[PDB]
Structure formats: C-alpha cells, structure tokens
Structure 1
Amino acid sequence: RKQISVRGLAGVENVTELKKNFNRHLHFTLVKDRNVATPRDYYFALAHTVRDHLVGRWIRTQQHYYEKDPKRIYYLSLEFYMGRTLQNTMVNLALENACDEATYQLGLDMEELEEIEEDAGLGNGGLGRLAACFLDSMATLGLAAYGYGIRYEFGIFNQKICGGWQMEEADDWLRYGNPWEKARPEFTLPVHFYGRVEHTSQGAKWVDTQVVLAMPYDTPVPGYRNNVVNTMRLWSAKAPNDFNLKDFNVGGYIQAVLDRNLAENISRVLYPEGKELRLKQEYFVVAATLQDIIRRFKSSKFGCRDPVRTNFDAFPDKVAIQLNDTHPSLAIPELMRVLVDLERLDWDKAWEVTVKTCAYTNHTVIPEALERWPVHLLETLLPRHLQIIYEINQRFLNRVAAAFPGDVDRLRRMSLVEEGAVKRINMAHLCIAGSHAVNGVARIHSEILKKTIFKDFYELEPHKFQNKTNGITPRRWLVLCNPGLAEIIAERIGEEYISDLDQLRKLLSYVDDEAFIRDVAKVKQENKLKFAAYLEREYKVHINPNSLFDVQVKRIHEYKRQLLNCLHVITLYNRIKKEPNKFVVPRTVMIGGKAAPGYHMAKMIIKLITAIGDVVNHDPVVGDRLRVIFLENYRVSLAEKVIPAADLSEQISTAGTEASGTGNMKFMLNGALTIGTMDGANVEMAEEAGEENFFIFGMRVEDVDRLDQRGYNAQEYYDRIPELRQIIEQLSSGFFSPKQPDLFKDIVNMLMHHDRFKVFADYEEYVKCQERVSALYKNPREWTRMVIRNIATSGKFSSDRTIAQYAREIWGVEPSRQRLPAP
C-alpha cells in the first residue's frame, strides 16, 4: 500500500533513460516494432515517452491540491483550441534538448515526428484559443485550475481549397488515438433531458427525463517549468445501451436507435440559430461538470470538514467557476437546482452561493449577438430549469424595482424574458444577475458594456462590471513558435521574460545596438526563409524570400474586411502593370481563415482572393514583385508557422467592431508591424508601443456613427477615386473570372449598394498608409527599430498578466511562479 509509489519510475533529463523508455513504449505500449513502424508510430513511441513525465507530476500536483485544499477554479468553455502538444510539453518540462538528443541517437529526427501530430481539434477561433492560453498561464501561476468542455470527436471542419472554392472536409483528428488524453469510463455521469416537474411536499422533482451519459477524458496541462500540471477534463456524450430489450420500450420498436445517435452527436461536432442541439450541447457540458465541481467540494477532504450541511457557505471560499461567454449560463440555474432541489437550501442561501460563484468573461459588443433561447424550447427539454430562471427573474426584477422605483420601462428592459412574436430568455441577462463579476476583455470593450449594452446593470450593480484585457501565453507564441527570437532576446536579457513578459522593456536599450538590430532582422530573414519553403513543399507557389510578408489571418467574415485587402492588392497589381519599371517594394500578400459553411459572402471572398491570386501569380509583367496567396486550413499550427514569418500584421476591421483580438498580439511579439484601425486591442497596443510605432488608419468609431448619421453612400467614393472605379469595373467585367464574367456580381453589388461595414470609406486612407508601409520597408534599419520597439513593449499582453488580474480581482486567489516540488 505505501509500497505503491510514484517514486522509482524516472531519470528525467537523461538521454539514455528516455531512449530506454522510447523502446518500451514502441514495443510494449504500441506493440509495434522497428520492422513495422511508421513515422505515425515513432511519434506514439516518443509522445508516450514524453507522457510518463507529464503524468508523474500530475500525480503529485493533484495529491498536492487535495492536501493543500486551495479554493478551486473551473474555466467552463465550450471550445479549447489546444492544437499540438509534443513540443509545448517538451519545453514546459524542459526535456526538448534531452529528447532531441535521444531520438537523434536512435536515428529518427525529432522535427519529423513533431509534424505528424494533427491539431487537437477542440476549438474554433478567438473564444477557444484564449481558453487554451489561460490554461498555460493558470498552470504557470501555480493556480489550482481546471478546463472543462465537451470532447468533440470531429472537432469542426478541416478546410480544403478546391477550384479556389472552399470545401469543408471532416476533422477526425481522433483517427489513431490522441495520446495526450486519458479515458475514464468509471466517472461516467447521468445528464438528464425532457421530463416533467412534479412538485411534491417539500419542493419539486424533475421526473421522467431521458438520460444521456457523460464520459470524461483527462488531458494533463503542464505549467512552465513550475512543476504543476493541471487538468482539462472534457466530456464525450454517450447513449445508454439498454436499447435492445432491457426496458420494454424496444424489442417491438427500436425507432429509438435515434435517441442513441441524437445522444452521441452532442459530442460529435462543434458549432461552427436556436437549435435544440446547441442548448443540448450547453446543458450537457455544464451538468456532468457541476457534479464533478460539487463532488470535489464534498470528497476533497471537505467531507471531514463538513461543520454544517458540508456547507455550501464554504462553497464560494473553496470553488470558483467562470462562464467564458454565455455558452455556460445554465451553470447558474443548474447550480440553483442542485442546491435547492437536490441538496436542500432555501432559495436565498442557494442564490447567495451562486452569485458569489459565478463570474462571466464577455466578448461580444453587438446586441444582435448576445445568447437568447426560446422559452418553449427551455420548457420541453429543460422544464425545471426554466422554472428556476423565472424565479430568478421575479426577484431580480423586484430588486430592480426597490432601486429604480416608479420605472416600469426599466423593469421591462432589464428582465431576463424578452417579448415579441416568440418570447425568449436573455441568456445575457441571466449571466449578469447570477454573477459577482462581469468583465469585458479589452478597455474600450468593457466600457461600451457599461455605457450602452449592459448599462442599467451598472447603475444597479456598478461594482460588478470590471474588465481583464485579453492576453496570450508567451510559451507557445514566442518560445515554442520562435526559438530564434527566443535565443537572441535571451542573449541580451536572460529567461524571466518567458515567465514575466513586461520585462521586455529592457530591450528598449538595445534600440540602436547594431548587434541587436542585425540579429532581430536576421532571425526574421530565416523565419521567412523556411516558410517560403513549406509554401513549396506542403502546398505550392514560388515565393520571393525578400518580400514584405503581408499577412491577414481572420474569421473570413465581411466586417473583418479581407475585401479592403483585396482592393489594395488589385491596386498594386494595376500600378505595377501601368508602369512595369517603377520600383515598388516586392510583397507577398497571404490571406487565410475559414469561411463557416453556408455564409455565401464569405465563401465568395475566399474565391475572390484565389481569383486574384491566379491572375497576378501568372502575370509575366509582374515577376515576383507581387503574389497573392490564400493559406488553407488555418488552424493553431499554421498560426505558429505564418506568425514568425509575417512582417505586416493586417488588423483592419471597421472601426468599433473587434472587441479585442488575441492574434493582434501574436504578431507584435513576433516582430511584425501592425497596420490596422483604431479599435479592439489595437487601442492598447498603439498606447503601449506609442502610436508612431503603429500603422493606425481609417475612420475612428466617432466618424463611423457620423457616417451612418449622414448616411454612407458608396457611389460618391466610387465617383471620386479613379483606381476604385477601375477595380469595380474589373470585378464586374470578369477580368478576374474570365470564364464566368458575371461571377462576382454579388460582391460588387454588395460593396456598391449595401455594405454594412464601410469598406470604400476606408479605401483612400488605407492605400496611402500602406504606401507609407512599403516606404519604411525600403530602409531596413528603421523598420527593424520599429519592430524592436513593438517587441520591447509586448509585456502588457501576456496571459500571465490577464490571469493574474483574474486571480486577484475576481476569483480571489494568488498567483505564484514558485516551483512546486515533484517529480
């Protein structure tokens, strides 16, 4: 019994030990052989050799939180865009050199094997990248955090570009095992659906509900060299398998083969309207999760620290939950149902705890995009739940009335029940009332909440509405993805930056040290250098290494504007053609990002970009002065190749729309100048780096409302700007689409007569700011000193800063970069 220890089983930074481990796992774990192993196979030998270590310290950390019993935090997000684990784990545990050597002494090359991992498809964009960072920062700050979501089996789609059109294939990344995960069949939970609420004697009972099982899968998350390892626990839905004879519902009719697949496809796919499955996916992730959350409050020692009721009074001291966007709001009335109905509190002692537990990160500005379920839709599958939302509602509106008496109209605006044809429940307003903290994720954003969207919630609850600006981990997004720039910044100032990012202001000294400046510019020559090559090796094009690597990686969506970027590239194209012998700085424009199926505009912009590509990349007069490339199947591992190589990050949305924007940041740290509008997280970058180290352009939010005020009329810009008029007439005649002239009819017409986002309006200003960009690229010592100034300033954007701010002003715990003991 004490004889069964974690203890004898390692050698750590030891080549010979890891080469010994690799041979066991290839032949005993993999029951494969050198006479038979694939590349795919030697990465499960290696990923298993690297997993031993990754879990020995998980053993230790988790015992370490039961004994220490710290308040615990649980990030509830329906999307964790993890993406590639071998190296982050090798470099968070410092075995990269020792491994590289072992596999090297064995005679495989580690880089080969690194690229066989398919990205852990549990995410989709902003929302879910973020969560993944917060796990590496929250582990690093030695915090006792948790990541709980659905394990999607088919992620979301993999993008194929065929015929310059977007084809969505399926991501079954789960194809030959995901070695980083551990299946725990044995903690399977009932998640309940439909049914009826029978109110009996002392309460109500939720009877006659279909049950679905929630199986967990454990993936350890290693903090940066601080020996902690936390957990991301995702749940796989599963059918009960009584479906055959056991129940006497079937035999005679197995038409509930359906129940079975409608149940399994809660875990089958990401989403991607008021759909019964989205709500099913939301309730599902919440509920199996709140039973682990409450379970650990009872079982994690606190069963012997009951004092009274194993009190849920000590629940907000020792648990904390985060609603990362309204996709877990049902955690609030799911919890009130567990406390009141299943435990036995009165509704205030149950609500006190709930409003003292839930804090909810926001990331939406436009009204139109706040979560809102139809109440009939809550009646059918969650009947008790919509009963509990209505309780919340009555009372919260009676608070509001205690406060703003006489006002009925405020009462009828602040309620969680929206009225029209089809009454809905404002999942936004549920989230706010059941919480001790709401916070936008960038200063301009948190304030517009208080000012225009959430305002009557701030007059009533002012203190509640904070902010905690977004940030990025430095480990994935500078060390792991940029060993070169990691190397020279180490030379001039050493490691604590990796674990402490505003420490990069130290670099402001070196702004004019000619060694530094040759070395920042050299590292970039070489990042571009390898990316020209994959842009030949794994897909095809003839890149000129020596060009302004102009990149734009966004959700392909109208307001993000890759049609402003398409127009500047047609305008360089035209320029370089009217005057073939003028020196225009050579550029490689690269746009990538997924459409999201059925959005027709988007699907047409992906084709526009590839139409233009085909024309300019085959125009002989052009040479290599200009090339337009669509990057395909942009996902976390491309983002880590393309970002090191970018020289210009195009962060161009309509002034006022982006709420923040995690990639804005990834570029800055990787030394690329940002061209972009004054909005989102540009706002606090052009403040950190000083405005003139930034290419801020266009309309400010100010003058967009103004433009709407006198009415934007696209045709007047059409009638003055003479290169515009020219590209519009090129689009329409089918210069870019010769076999179907009329193919871009929709895009043209859009621009010209009903563009909600004011692309033409920012067209003169954007072409001129780019002229200033190619000008400054034509002078390597100053573009590199701008870059040095943008990197020197990255610090305000670590996820270690953001998470700190969470721990101290919301979750109430203290960060610690102190090493935990272990192995």
Structure 2
Amino acid sequence: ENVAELKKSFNRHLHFTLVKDRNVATTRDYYFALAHTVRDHLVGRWIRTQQHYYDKCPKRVYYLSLEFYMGRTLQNTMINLGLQNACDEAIYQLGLDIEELEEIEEDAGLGNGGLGRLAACFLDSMATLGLAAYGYGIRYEYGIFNQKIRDGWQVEEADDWLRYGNPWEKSRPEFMLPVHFYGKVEHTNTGTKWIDTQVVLALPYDTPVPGYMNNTVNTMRLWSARAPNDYIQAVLDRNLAENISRVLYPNDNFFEGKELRLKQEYFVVAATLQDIIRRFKASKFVFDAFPDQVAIQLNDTHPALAIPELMRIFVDIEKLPWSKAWELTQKTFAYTNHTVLPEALERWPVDLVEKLLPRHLEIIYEINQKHLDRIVALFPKDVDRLRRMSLIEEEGSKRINMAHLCIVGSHAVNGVAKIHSDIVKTKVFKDFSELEPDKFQNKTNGITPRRWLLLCNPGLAELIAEKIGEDYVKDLSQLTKLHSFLGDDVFLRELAKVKQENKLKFSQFLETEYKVKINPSSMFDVQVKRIHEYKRQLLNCLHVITMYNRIKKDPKKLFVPRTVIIGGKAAPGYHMAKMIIKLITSVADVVNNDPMVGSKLKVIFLENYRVSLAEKVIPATDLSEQISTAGTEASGTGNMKFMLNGALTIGTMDGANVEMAEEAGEENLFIFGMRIDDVAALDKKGYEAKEYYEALPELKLVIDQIDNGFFSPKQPDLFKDIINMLFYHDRFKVFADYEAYVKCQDKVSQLYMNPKAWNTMVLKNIAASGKFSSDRTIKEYAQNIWNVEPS
C-alpha cells in the first residue's frame, strides 16, 4: 500500500520474477516489475468478489461480444485501486520514470472502434456499480493492426500484442471446453444428434476488471482456440484449428461473410453458453429459474448464434420441450442494435451455415416457422409482411438476416441514442415493434469517467475536484454544480490553463513523431475515429484545402491559427478510405511546407489511432469534429470524450450529438448542416452533386485542385476515384453540407478569438456532460433490461 512496501515488492519482482538486477534490467523489465507489483493488489479482492457472487448468488449479467477494446491496464488499475500516487512516488524514488514504464505496455486492441470500446467502458462501469457482471469474448492473438503511413498511404502491420507476455491475463485451464463444427445431424429415437463433428478446444483466459474504489473486481473471460489431443504435416495442421482465435477482423461497420468469421462467432458463443450453463448448475441454487439467474446481452448481431445454440442445449441435450426452451431463451437474451448502415448488416448465406452448423440451420428454420405461423394467424392477408419479417431472405441466394433472429429470440432490443433507437423501432423494424411495442427501447451510450477523465486528464479532474469535491467521479451528474462558476474569471483562466498544459504536452509528442513544428498558440481542430465515407473526414479535408487557398489569396489577413489533426485506421480492404487517407497526407504535405502559410496552419495525420493515443490527443483538443451525415452515426462516443475534456463540438444533428445539444443547450455547440429530414428530402428529389460544385466558387477551386493534380503533381489522376465518387456516387452528400460546414467553421474561429467567451461555452459543455457517463447507461440497462441491482 505505502511507498516503502511498494518499492520492496518492485525490487522483489524485478529479482525473482524478471531475474534481473538494476544494471542489466531493461525498460520492459521495469514495466513488468511494476505491473506485477500492482497486479498483486488485485488478487485478494478478485477472489472475494467472485466468492461473494457464488455465496449470495445475485443474478449475473453476461456481456457477449466479439470485441473488447481495452487499451492499456496499468494506469487504469492503479487509479481504480487508489494506488497511483503511491506508485508514482515509489517509482520516482527508485530513480525511474513511471511515464516511460507506462509507454512500454501494448494496448489490448481487441476491437475496431465504437462498438468494442463501448464494451470496455461497460465493464468498468458494471464493476464500479458492483454488478455481478462478466465480459465474454475471444482472445485474438492479433488485435486491430498497427497502422503505418508510407509514401502517404496506410500500410498494415501485425499487432503482435502478446509477444512479450500479458501479465494481465490468467489462464483457466480447468475450464477448457470442446466446441463442435461441421459434422451432420441424425434424428434418432433418443433425440436429434449432431455427429461426426470436428472439435476445437476453447481455453479461457481471465482478466480482472477493477471497479473504481470499491473492492469489486469482476472478470473478462476471453477464449483462445486450441487443437484437441504424414506425422509432421498433421502436427503443423493444428494451426488450422488455432487460426479461429488468431486475428480480429479489421472491419468497422461493414459485413464480410468469410467462413472464418462465422467460425469465430460460433466459437465464442458455444464456449460461452456452455460455461454459463455449467456455472448455473453449480450455483447450488430445473432450468426454470435460469432467466432469473442469467441475463445475456448480445452486443450487435455478431453473437446472434447464441440464440439457436441455447435452444440446441436445452432441447438436444437437456431434453426440455421446445415451447419451454423457447420461453426460457427469450427471457435470457436482450439484443443491442449498433447501426443502420446496409453494408454493416449480417446476412449469412444458408449454404455456408448449413455446411458449418447443420443443426443450427435446422433450429433457425424451426424458429422461423413458428414465427411466421404467428404472423399468418394475425395478418392472414398481408402476404408481403411475412416476406419482410422472415429470418430468411430468398432474394437471390438465400441468407439469414441475423438482426431478425436476434429480435425474435430476445425480450428486449435497444438502440444506442434516441434518434437511433427511434429509427430502429419505427422504421427498420416497424413490423416487429408494431407487434411487440414494449420490446424496443433506447439506452443512450456512455463513456467511463475513470479512463476518460481521471486517467487521461488528471489536470482537469483535479481542477474540477478543487471546486466541487469528488462525488462527481461516481455520480457524473454532479458536474452541473460547475455552473456556479460561469462568471468566475479566475476559474475560467484555470480551465484554459489546464487545456494549455495538455496541448503543450501533446505538442511535444507531435514534434518528436512528426517533422512538423507546432504553433502552441493555435486552435487544435481534431477529427479522430475510423476512416469512413459516412464519418466524412473527406468533408473536413475539403475545408482544410479551403482555408489553405484563403491564406494564399490573402496572407496578411487576420486569421486564428489552427493545427488540424485527423487520424484513424482504414479497414484493409476499404479502398475509398485508403484513398481518403492518401488525400489527407498529400494535402498536409503542401500545407505544412508552403512558406506563405507557415505557422498559420499545420496539418497532421495522426498515425495508429487507438485507445492509448486517444487518451493523449483528446485532452489537448479545442475543436471536436463530429460531422457524420445526419442519420448515419447511430450514437458516437468519441463526441462524448471530447465534451468531457474541455473541447467544443462542431457537428451535425446526428446520433448522440443531438443529446449533447439537449443537455448543454444547442447554442453551446456548433451545429450545422442537413438534419435527418432534410437528407430524406434530398434523397427523394435526387442528389445532384454537380450543382453545389457549380454554385460554390470555393468548393469548385478545391475540387479542381484535387482533380488536376495540385496535391499529386507526380501523378495528376491519382485522386480520380474520389472525384468520381464525389460527383456520381456520394451516398453521404459531402457537397450538400459543405457550405453550412464552412460557414459554421468561420463562426468557430470567431468565438476562439474571444478566450473568455470560448471558455465560458466550454464550461457549459463540461458542466452538462454528466448524462454521458457509462455509469448512467449501465443503471438503465440493469433496471429496464437485465433486472439486476447496483451494489
């Protein structure tokens, strides 16, 4: 606990655990010694917490997800355990730099973006709320790839995060389980049997999840695939079974029907459900009480197979009758929808499923038959309603609509922001909500204020605590008390000072990683998120070039200097996203080297955007770019992180941006562009991109520069694919929000010129960010879906 004992443990681990002394120990050795020193502090409570759940047997919550975008664990653990100050002191006394030790840790990047990071924030919140919750996923050998930029383009490198060892995971060999694939179904007089299957073992690894200052330490269980049991070739072929948990599919909001992805989904699902049933049978609590002891949240449709798998276990194995089994199943599962973009919908062809999971295909067909029998009985004449509500789309080569399977097999279905949940309920699944009104809900996303405030921005956390105490950490709504300081000049300077320090520290980072020199006086304009056409960093890029031309046309004009930062990873096979990245690095090259613009404007493509880098750049941001086309971003969470950390937002009325406006007051955000209904109008009328190109002189110059090679001289036609998409296939109407966006941007610079007014708006944003704590989000899930209670 105290400094002396922490130093003693550190030296002890460096010695016995790392087998080193101070003259031969590497930096990595020191990081590992500290990690083990911190990890030791988790054990007692990890054991008690899990023992407690067995004793008092509260209802358990299982968050089933193919992704857990955890980031680093060291600092997060020290903070939630109240050990950071002591460890900082101990490490300092040992003559070491704790910051350096922390940078040695690899991010556990087992996620693509929002969906995976939401799972991570939820685990922190559920532990902080004292819920008997478990995270269940896959332990990928390789997470989201490390991004490099070569000659302006994205290059992918394997994310070998486990190469040096992960001290934060605990193998649980005694819980290994067999998972089945392929084979065939036999309908015997003893029950249908699934036989001649190939077997792959599932080895679980537990990672502790410390609640914030509360003695609760929950568990995240990730499964790894292992082979069971010419000789050499046979041994090498063991790689095939093990490839199942080998790599995270690098796609964000995009469906790719590869068989290996289907294997991963069944793998997690099968291992997870069996483990859950086994723990249920040992609870010394037949399966009638199951739904009162178990809640399983389906994170998107990725784990949809859990439904037919639970049915398979209840029926084929436990011999329960179908009706009883189906009843228990619905009461067990709840489904969370995370998107409305067509390219992201999971639709598995029945042939692939038939080959890999013959018995699940049969169970799904059965589910679908009973389902449609009901509709036929309710709307005998609506024949097309049946076609629309079926789990099977015969529309060409038959496929399974996984979202529909999740809806019929779940008692609750929720979206992740009001605007989104509404669209899901009344438009996308109108036929279903009409039948079961009460089944559809909304649960607006949230972020954990531990990692995204206390951890990433200690200066702000301290300043806030200075003024209003520490209650806000566990009750973020407490930030409204900050309103008492609206006219407090001294406080406003203190707030600005914290942002300035964060910017200074991040600028140091930028100068050492990039050739560029940073004007620390500039406004940090930031857009960090996965590269997507719908998120439109392309629009941001149009505005950047626009500011460039303005400086060239009139260099002596008064101008608020900016440092424009854009970062994010493109899915490997997403060609347009890769072109967009190259467009940004090209533009940056011209801008950063034009002697006429100089320190007026700097552009940086932030490489390898991931959780640990987000913790650095967000606290250093002044302007947060949340410009997705109205109706495309289901919720967003980066928007919330920026709001909590003192940045103002420039964005569309989309996803949770709408709620950030409700809480803070629309005028305290720079809202702009078409709204959901305006986008529909343009669609109805038909979008003619050329018209804006024609009518907007600044837009036309930008476009022409791009298309003629102004930014790619050595290859004039390089950006032709973008031009063509922009003029003839822009599903996201980049040109249609261009004018309002730029006008809006000008207004931002205006406000920035007035520090007191700017920080006054910042204060209103921070003071109103309380609704976005994931602790609030989780309370709502616990109360209205899982029916469990905080402790």
TM-score tier, shorter chain, comes to over 0.9
Tell me the CA shift for residue 257 of structure 1: 5.5
- Answer yes or no: is 1:318 the counterpart of 2:293: yes
Structure 2 CA distance for aligned equivalents of residues 79 and 115 of structure 1 = 23
Counterpart residue identity of residue 195, structure 1: G
Question: Equivalent of 2:339, from 329, 343, 364?
Answer: 364
Q: Paired residue for 2:592, among 599, 617, 640?
A: 617
Alignment partners' CA distance in 1, 2:781 and 2:507: 40
In angstroms, what is the RMSD of aligned CA positions? 1.2
Structure 2 counterpart SS, 1:545: coil
Does residue 530 of the first structure (1) align with residue 505 of the second (2)? yes
What's 2:219 paired with?
231
Structure 2 counterpart of 1:780:
755
Aligned counterparts of 1:488 and 1:420: Cα–Cα separation in 2: 59
- Tell me the secondary structure at the aligned position of residue 628 of structure 2: coil
Aligned to 1:350: 325
Conserved 8 A contact 2:141-2:246: yes
SS, match of residue 558 in structure 2: coil
For the pair 1:178 / 2:197, whether they are aligned, the reply is: no
Measured after TM superposition, the shift of residue 368 of structure 1 is: 4.4
Q: What is the deviation of 1:259?
A: 5.1
Question: 1:747 offset after TM fit, Å?
Answer: 1.4
Name the count of aligned residue pairs: 786
Aligned partners of 2:774, 2:542: CA distance in 1, in Å?
35
Query: Deviations 1:583-623 (Å, cap 9, x if unpaired)?
Result: 11000000000011121111111111111111010111112
**What code does the residue aligned with 1:25 have?**
H
Structure 2 residue identity aligned to 1:460: L
Q: For each residue in 1:246-283, what CA deviation from the matched residue of structure 2 results, as whole angstroms up to 9, or x when unmatched?
A: xxxx65xx765575222111111011122111110000
Q: Which residue of 2 aligns with 1:587?
A: 562
Instruction: Kindly indicate whether the alpha-carbon contact (under 8 Å) linking 1:69 and 1:301 is maintained by their aligned counterparts in 2.
Output: no
Q: Which runs of 5+ in 1 are unaligned?
A: 1-11, 242-249, 303-310, 817-823
Q: CA deviation at 1:92?
A: 0.1
User: Which of these residues, 257, 263, 272, is aligned with residue 289 of structure 1?
Assistant: 272
Say yes or no: does 1:278 pair with 2:261: yes
In the other structure, the counterpart of 2:52 is 64
Alignment partner, residue 253 of structure 2: none
Counterpart CA distance in 1 for 2:695 and 2:121 is 47
What letter matches 1:151 in structure 2? R
How big is each residue's C-alpha offset from its partner over 1:424-470, in whole Å with a ceiling of 9 and x where there is no partner? 11111110001110000101111111111111111111111111110
1:98 aligns with 2:81: no
- What is the aligned partner in structure 2 of residue 742 from structure 1? 717
- Consecutive aligned runs of 4 or more in structure 1 exceeding 4 Å deviation: 254-259
Asked if the contact 1:189–1:288 (Cα under 8 Å) also holds between the matched residues in 2, the reply is: yes
Among 467, 475, 483, the residue aligned to 2:442: 467
What secondary structure, in the 3-state scheme, does the structure 1 residue paired with 2:651 have?
strand
Alignment partners' CA distance in 2, 1:655 and 1:520: 32
User: In the aligned structure 2, how far is the partner of 1:404 from the partner of 1:235?
Assistant: 44
- Residue type of the partner of 1:443? K
CA deviation string 1:393-446 (max 9, x = no partner): 111112222332332221222111110221011111110001110000101111
**1:165 aligns to 2:153 (yes or no):** yes
TM-score (norm 2): 0.98
Report Cα offsets for 1:726-761 as digits up to 9, x if no partner. Answer: 111111221111111121122122212221111111
Give the SS at the match of 1:642.
helix
For each residue in 1:107-143, what CA deviation from the matched residue of structure 2 results, as whole angstroms up to 9, or x when unmatched?
1121111111111121110110000000000001100
Deviations 1:335-372 (A, max 9, x none): 01111111111011111110000001111113443211
Which residue of 2 is the match for residue 15 of structure 1? Answer: 3
Aligned position for 1:793: 768
Matched position secondary structure for 1:541: coil
1:109 corresponds in structure 2 to 97
Q: Give 2:548's aligned residue.
A: 573
Contact 2:483–2:767, Cα closer than 8 Å, also in 1: yes
Q: How does 1:744-759 map to 2 (within 5 A)?
A: 744-759=719-734
Are 1:680 and 2:655 an aligned pair?
Answer: yes
Whether the 8 Å CA contact 2:417–2:634 is kept in 1: the answer is yes
Quick one: which of 588, 600, 625 aligns to 2:575? Answer: 600
In structure 1, distance between residues paired with 2:514 and 2:174: 44
Give the equivalent residue in structure 1 for 2:413: 438
| 2-structure distance, mates of 1:294, 1:87 | 35
1: CA distance, partners of 2:318 / 2:362: 17
In 2, the alpha carbon distance for the partners of 1:366 and 1:726 equals: 32
> C-alpha separation between the residues in 2 aligned to 1:596 and 1:602?
8
Equivalent pair of 1:551/1:650 in contact (CA under 8 Å): yes
Contact kept in structure 2, 1:367 and 1:453, CA below 8 Å = no
Pairwise mapping of residues 258-657 of structure 1 onto structure 2 (< 5 A)?
A: 260-272=238-250, 273-302=256-285, 311-657=286-632
Give 2:196's match in structure 1, choosing from 205, 208, 228: 208
Q: Distance in 2 between matches of 1:217 and 1:33?
A: 31
Tell me, in whole angstroms, the C-alpha distance in 1 between the residues paired with 2:484 and 2:61: 40
The answer to whether the 8 A contact 1:371-1:428 is kept is yes
Indicate if the aligned counterparts of 2:330 and 2:411 stay in contact, CA closer than 8 A.
yes
Scaled by the length of structure 1, what TM-score is found? 0.94
Which has the higher mean CA deviation after the structures are superposed, 411-420 or 633-642? 411-420
- Distance between the aligned counterparts of 2:377 and 2:344, measured in 1? 30
Contact 2:201–2:227 (CA under 8 A) maintained in structure 1:
yes
Letter in 2 for 1:502: S
SS of the equivalent of 1:466 reads strand
Picking from 12, 24, 27, the partner of 2:12 is 24
Select 1:189's aligned residue among 153, 159, 177: 177
Q: Is residue 47 from structure 1 mapped to residue 39 from structure 2 by the alignment?
A: no
Uncovered stretches (5+) of structure 2, i.e. residues with no partner: 251-255
Percent identity over the alignment is 82
Cα distance in 2, alignment partners of residues 173 and 33 from structure 1: 26
Amino acid in the other structure paired with 2:357: L
Tell me the distance in 2 between the aligned counterparts of 1:598 and 1:813.
42
1:217 to 181, 205, 209: 205
For residue 34 of structure 1, the aligned residue among 10, 14, 22 is 22
| Pair 1:722 & 2:697 matched | yes
Q: Is the 8 Å Cα contact of residues 391 and 404 (structure 2) preserved in structure 1?
A: yes
The answer as to whether partners of 2:710 and 2:716 remain within 8 angstroms in 1 is yes
Structure 2 residue identity aligned to 1:370 = L
Is the 2:109–2:610 contact (alpha carbons within 8 Å) kept by the matching residues of 1? no
Distance in 1 (CA, whole Å) between partners of 2:356 and 2:722 is 41
- Match of 1:176, SS state, is coil
Residue 555 of structure 1 deviates from its aligned partner by 1.4
Contact 1:403 1:460 in 2 (8 A): no
- Write the distance in 1 (CA, Å) between the matches of 2:442 and 2:543: 36
Tell me the distance in 1 between the aligned counterparts of 2:308 and 2:610: 35
Structure-2 change in CA distance of 1:460 and 1:259 (3 Å): farther
What is the CA–CA distance in structure 1 between the aligned matches of 2:284 and 2:467, rounded to whole Å? 48
Q: Is the 8 A contact 1:239 1:259 kept in 2?
A: no
| Partner SS for 2:520 | coil
**Aligned-partner Cα distance in 2 for 1:28–1:424:** 56
Q: Give the letter aligned to residue 42 of structure 1.
A: Y
The answer on whether the counterparts of 1:67 and 1:301 sit within 8 Å (CA) in structure 2 is no
Aligned to 2:122: 134
